Scaffold this active site. Sequence first.
Site, mmCIF file in Angstrom:
data_model
loop_
_atom_site.group_PDB
_atom_site.id
_atom_site.type_symbol
_atom_site.label_atom_id
_atom_site.label_comp_id
_atom_site.label_asym_id
_atom_site.label_seq_id
_atom_site.Cartn_x
_atom_site.Cartn_y
_atom_site.Cartn_z
ATOM 1 N NE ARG A 71 -3.990 1.931 2.060
ATOM 2 C CZ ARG A 71 -4.482 2.954 2.755
ATOM 3 N NH1 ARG A 71 -3.906 3.335 3.891
ATOM 4 N NH2 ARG A 71 -5.561 3.591 2.312
ATOM 5 C CG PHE A 76 -0.579 9.002 3.961
ATOM 6 C CD1 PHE A 76 -0.092 9.491 5.155
ATOM 7 C CD2 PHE A 76 -1.625 8.087 3.984
ATOM 8 C CE1 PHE A 76 -0.643 9.071 6.352
ATOM 9 C CE2 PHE A 76 -2.179 7.667 5.164
ATOM 10 C CZ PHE A 76 -1.690 8.156 6.357
ATOM 11 C CD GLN A 79 0.104 -0.381 5.374
ATOM 12 O OE1 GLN A 79 -0.554 0.449 4.742
ATOM 13 N NE2 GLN A 79 -0.425 -1.126 6.329
ATOM 14 C CG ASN A 118 -2.045 0.392 14.951
ATOM 15 O OD1 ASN A 118 -3.208 0.763 14.813
ATOM 16 N ND2 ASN A 118 -1.059 1.233 15.268
ATOM 17 C CG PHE A 129 3.230 3.735 8.336
ATOM 18 C CD1 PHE A 129 2.716 3.106 9.456
ATOM 19 C CD2 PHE A 129 3.314 5.121 8.327
ATOM 20 C CE1 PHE A 129 2.313 3.839 10.557
ATOM 21 C CE2 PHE A 129 2.912 5.869 9.436
ATOM 22 C CZ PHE A 129 2.410 5.233 10.542
ATOM 23 C CG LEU A 138 -0.955 8.573 11.253
ATOM 24 C CD1 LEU A 138 -0.104 7.605 10.443
ATOM 25 C CD2 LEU A 138 -2.388 8.135 11.279
ATOM 26 C CG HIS A 142 -0.107 4.268 13.459
ATOM 27 N ND1 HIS A 142 -0.370 3.016 12.951
ATOM 28 C CD2 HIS A 142 -1.176 5.037 13.147
ATOM 29 C CE1 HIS A 142 -1.546 3.030 12.350
ATOM 30 N NE2 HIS A 142 -2.058 4.242 12.459
#
Length: 182
Positions: A71, A76, A79, A118, A129, A138, A142
Amino acid sequence: FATRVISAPKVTKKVFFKISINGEDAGTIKFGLFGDDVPKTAENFRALCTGEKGMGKLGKPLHYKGSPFHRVIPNFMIQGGDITSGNGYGGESIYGSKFADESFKITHDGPGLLSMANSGPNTNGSQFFITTVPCPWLNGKHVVFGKVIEGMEIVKKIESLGSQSGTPKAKIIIADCGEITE
């Protein structure tokens, strides 16, 4: 004995990935882990780069080698780290099961941070990531545990192969990985 003034956590250990893109060598990415601040999280990630822990409860190697960047979202993060089913739903930690979030004190302040993917609180497995922008939202969700120290140009490259849905436009692989003992 005190020698420099860091605005960041100390890099305890170093590991690397070697990236293949559609079967072609794309370069290396070196990471520094914050083993003093998130030790269990840094150790998990390090032994997944070595494979030294052998075979997990799920019947796959505890080993990043061969896992994809499943992904990739531009502006951004990228991952990967799905080492069981390899499709973005799997993953396994070196602790038998998902372990608790260690600490939220290193925040998502800029690009090039390693952080744990997660599925909620205390669901850390092997999926990680790398930020490519600041992700203050985040924070508290995370666990940041490392950073890119060499090869951000390659993180930038994998990002460009992404989409807003996040489905990758090429097959991006951790072709090899290890620790930098030195």
